[PDB]
């Protein structure tokens, strides 16, 4: 009763503060510069060998090897330069919707409908890749996972909850519980001190890893947020949602700055990624092709057409050399 | 060959990996995947037991055919976000308890009816065949003798006999199949002490396979 009224008053206060902070629009400031003329990226490489829909890919920190997860229970490590398979890890459960590459490169992680995050050691004294840890504490499907370091990993699940684990012991040291809908994405900050997570309740929550509690909440979408990504600066992020819309939220301003959408697109967004400088926002839509937007002007700079099904995953190298797009047609494509 | 010895050996390793991947993916193409669905009291623990957290996978064999059943009832999350993982599937085995026409959790039979309506007309299963099982037929036979079916369907207007009532329930469930020109519904009445459902699933899957490779051959 009274608590609900207090919560409504607090929400109104937050909205009023955000409106007061809205001095201007980023579009007005960015209208004074020349946009990118026309981005034209051709398929430099085509990686084949997956025999099912590809659901997640992740580049290595050296940005030459990349891990890819598919529904045939396969985790393939590709040498992007020469197009050869370094490793092919068979998964215990073929229902996987996420995969991660350790920043050091010694480990990979995967998870899905088994509610478990499995860690595989790439560099063993033997010649194989073996599973080291099975983090099983979530009550819903695992939507994303990101290595903090060689021994810390944060995983978001469909039980409206994120967790930060200790891979040495396998026990989730921290639990982040503030979401009302299933969490579908994660994005570590460049300094890896805090992260963002978008949920099915059209809300993106920024959490602090060290304290363990939610720091900020952003609400500008209308449907589920399927993808989130952090700006290279670290003071902004982008969310792709099911209403065919991307939104650029800020941290210090605590409000959305730009809305990337078009009347010609009515299909959801499965993945987002940024260029190295952050000028290009790459979003993998459901219309079988990715779109490259000018992140400062909200202009569709280009289209990465060339996939025969939905683009599920999409990543950018650490040096910004290439863009990898996976898709439901079982083919990965490196563009430049 | 403009390659080093190490690079050539790496290419050879990649070729061996390719061969293993092709063999694995050709082994998985000869297996039949069935998605099992139902309600809490609909009854699918008996069906799994007869033809034999996270989702459960059951493997069995029948007449040189390997079947995988995906029991996903434990995933108490948004079904819209993980149902497309089963888009390419041979058939959907939908279990419904026909003895709960008067039970209340909101009638249980009505809950099963809306769940069937949602699953059958799903965008990911616009052509996937459905094997409908109606479980606990002895309990329904005992219940219909005393309590009329009109509890669930006020507009029944039919004889209060097991055969007519069961036929009416089956017709009511099959009428939810919107656009019945691309998909089939293989309704079946089962019981706890009845071992014939494996053959029924095998026949339905055989028809599905015939249709699938007729599409593959381009005859359709």
């Amino acid at each position: 009763d009274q608590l609900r009224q207090e919560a409504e008053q607090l929400k109104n206060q937050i909205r009023d503060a955000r409106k007061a902070c809205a001095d201007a629009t980023l579009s007005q400031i960015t209208n004074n510069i020349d946009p990118v003329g026309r981005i034209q990226m051709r398929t430099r490489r085509t990686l084949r060998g997956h025999l099912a829909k590809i659901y997640a890919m992740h580049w290595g920190t050296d940005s030459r090897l990349l891990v890819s997860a598919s529904q045939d229970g396969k985790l393939i490590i590709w040498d992007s330069y020469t197009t050869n398979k370094v490793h092919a890890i068979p998964l215990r459960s073929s229902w996987v919707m996420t995969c991660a590459y350790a920043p050091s490169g010694n480990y990979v992680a995967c998870g899905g409908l088994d509610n478990i995050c499995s860690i595989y050691n790439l560099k063993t004294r033997e010649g194989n890749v073996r599973v080291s840890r099975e983090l099983a504490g979530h009550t819903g499907y695992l939507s994303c996972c990101r290595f903090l370091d060689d021994n810390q990993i944060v995983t978001s699940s469909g039980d409206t909850t994120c967790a930060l684990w200790d891979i040495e012991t396998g026990q989730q040291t921290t639990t982040f519980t503030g979401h009302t809908g299933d969490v579908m994405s994660l994005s570590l900050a460049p300094d890896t001190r805090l992260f963002v997570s978008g949920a099915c309740d059209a809300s993106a929550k920024l959490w602090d890893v060290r304290e363990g509690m939610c720091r900020q909440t952003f609400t500008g979408h209308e449907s589920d947020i399927n993808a989130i990504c952090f700006f290279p600066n670290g003071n902004a992020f982008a969310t792709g949602s099911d209403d065919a819309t991307c939104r650029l939220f800020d941290l210090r301003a605590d409000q959305e700055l730009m809305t990337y959408s078009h009347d010609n697109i009515i299909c959801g967004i499965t993945s987002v990624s940024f260029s190295k400088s952050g000028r290009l926002l790459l979003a993998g839509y459901d219309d079988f092709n990715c779109n490259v937007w000018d992140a400062l002007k909200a202009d569709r700079a280009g289209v990465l057409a060339g996939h025969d099904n939905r683009v599920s995953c999409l990543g950018v190298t650490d040096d910004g050399m290439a863009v990898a797009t996976g898709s439901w047609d079982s083919f990965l494509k490196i563009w430049n | 060959c403009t390659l080093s010895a190490e690079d050539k050996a790496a290419v050879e390793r990649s070729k061996m990996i390719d061969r293993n991947l092709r063999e694995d993916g050709e082994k998985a193409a000869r297996e039949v995947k069935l998605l099992l669905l139902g309600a809490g009291e609909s009854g699918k623990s008996t069906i799994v037991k007869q033809m034999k957290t996270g989702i459960v996978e059951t493997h069995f064999t029948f007449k040189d055919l390997h079947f995988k059943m995906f029991d996903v009832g434990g995933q108490r999350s948004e079904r819209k976000k993980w149902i497309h993982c089963f888009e390419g599937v041979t058939a959907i085995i939908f279990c419904v308890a026909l003895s709960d026409y008067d039970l209340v959790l909101m009638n249980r039979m009505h809950e099963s009816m809306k769940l069937f309506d949602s699953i059958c007309n799903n965008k990911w299963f616009t052509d996937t065949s459905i094997i409908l099982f109606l479980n606990k037929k002895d309990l329904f036979e005992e219940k219909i003798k005393k309590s009329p079916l009109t509890i669930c369907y006020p507009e029944y207007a039919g004889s209060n006999t097991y055969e007519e009532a069961a036929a009416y329930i089956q017709c009511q469930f099959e009428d939810l199949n919107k656009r019945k020109d691309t998909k089939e519904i293989y309704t079946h009445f089962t019981c706890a002490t009845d071992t014939k459902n494996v053959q029924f699933v095998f026949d339905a899957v055989t028809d599905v396979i015939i249709k699938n490779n007729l599409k593959d051959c381009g005859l359709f």
């Epitope: - | 190490e6 050996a9 050879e12 390793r13």
Partner: single-chain antibody, 232 residues
Framework: VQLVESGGGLVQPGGSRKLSCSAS????????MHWVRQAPEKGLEWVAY????????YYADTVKGRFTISRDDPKNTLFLQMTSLRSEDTAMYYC??????????????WGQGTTLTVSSSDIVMTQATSSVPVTPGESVSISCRSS???????????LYWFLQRPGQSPQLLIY???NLASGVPDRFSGSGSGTAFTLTISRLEAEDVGVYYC?????????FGAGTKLEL
């Protein structure tokens, strides 16, 4: 991981013998394997190579057409059949594992060695230094020269450094110049520029005293280099 060799012994010249190495402790089927021989008083010399799945088999021109290498993957064993044993075939044979992918470390583990005594275009690798007198705690640089440039188009410089302690099989320190192996102390460092290479030890204990060999993996037949003994 271990590789135990068997065979050897005293063989009359013109005879034949089969060397068998049993591998136990690693995924044998995913490793290419090599036979490398060392004369009773001379340095190392490569002999044979068989890939993963036996899809590629190479021999040295000193033994090509006379030796036959093979592998039993299900039984986890490597075989070398030697026919028409000359008097120059007496040596100690080491079976070596090497796996080739991006970032791999070939020649990482060496076998114990089996002895074999018989009764009575190549890239030349030069180790001019020999019997270098050294003292613990100092810094020692070992030089090496190559007849052909080991640097490749992709950017790799296929120069490998091996340390053989007295009475022990050689062990890998650097598997490509400036790439330190696993389990090797950080003091060892490798550098090179074209056809001239240098292995540096900033501080040395009494353990790292022995013969230092250089190998090239640019092209077959994988020519080694002469020894560089270090004296305490």
């Amino acid at each position: 991981v271990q590789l135990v060799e068997s065979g050897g012994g005293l063989v009359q010249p013109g005879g034949s013998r089969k060397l068998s190495c049993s591998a136990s402790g690693f995924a044998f089927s995913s490793f290419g394997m090599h036979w490398v021989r060392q004369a009773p008083e001379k340095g190392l010399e490569w002999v044979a190579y068989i890939s993963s799945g036996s899809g590629t088999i190479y021999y040295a021109d000193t033994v090509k057409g006379r030796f036959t290498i093979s592998r039993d993957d299900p039984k986890n064993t490597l075989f070398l059949q030697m026919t028409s044993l000359r008097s120059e075939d007496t040596a100690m044979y080491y079976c070596v594992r090497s796996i080739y992918y991006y970032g791999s470390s070939p020649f990482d583990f060496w076998g114990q060695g089996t002895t074999l005594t018989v009764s009575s275009s190549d890239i030349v690798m030069t180790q001019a230094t020999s019997s270098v007198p050294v003292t613990p705690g100092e810094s020692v640089s070992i030089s090496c020269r190559s007849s052909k440039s080991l640097l490749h188009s992709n950017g790799n410089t296929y120069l490998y450094w091996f340390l053989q302690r007295p009475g022990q099989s050689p062990q890998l320190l650097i598997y490509r110049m400036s790439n330190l192996a696993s389990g090797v102390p950080d003091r060892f460092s490798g550098s090179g520029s074209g056809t001239a290479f240098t292995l540096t030890i900033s501080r040395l204990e009494a353990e790292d005293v022995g013969v230092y060999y250089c190998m090239q993996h640019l092209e077959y037949p994988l020519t080694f280099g002469a020894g560089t003994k270090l004296e305490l």
